[PDB]
Amino acid sequence: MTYWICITNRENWEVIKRHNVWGVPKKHKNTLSRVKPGDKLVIYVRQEKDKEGNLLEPKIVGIYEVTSEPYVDFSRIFKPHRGGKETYPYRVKIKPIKIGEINFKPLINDLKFIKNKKRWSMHFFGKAMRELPEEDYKLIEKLLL
Ligand SMILES: [Ca+2]
Ligand SMILES: [Ca+2]
Full set of structural domains in the chain with CATH: 1-145 (3.10.590.10)
Whole-Å CA distances, 81 to 13, 25, 46, 92, 139: 11, 11, 11, 19, 28
Strand segments, DSSP code E, in 38-104 are 40-45, 48-49, 55-56, 59-66, 71-72, 90-103
CA distance 81 to 66: 23
For the CA atoms of the chain, what is the radius of gyration? 14
Gap from CA of 17 to ligand 2 centroid (Å): 22
Alpha-carbon span 112 to 103, nearest angstrom? 17
Q: Ligand 2 centre and the CA of 134: distance in Å?
A: 31
Dist CA 101 CA 87 (whole Å) = 26
Q: What is the resolution of this structure in A?
A: 1.4
Look at residues 131, 143, 52 and name the one whose alpha carbon lies nearest to residue 104.
143
105 C-alpha vs ligand 2 centroid, how far in Å? 28
Q: For residue 8, how far is its CA from the centre of ligand 1 (angstroms)?
A: 15
Residue 145 CA to ligand 2 center (angstroms) comes to 35
Is residue 81 within 8 A of residue 128, CB to CB? The reply is: no
- What's the burial of 46, exposed, middle or buried (CB within 10 Å: 0-12/13-18/19+)? middle
Experimental approach was X-ray
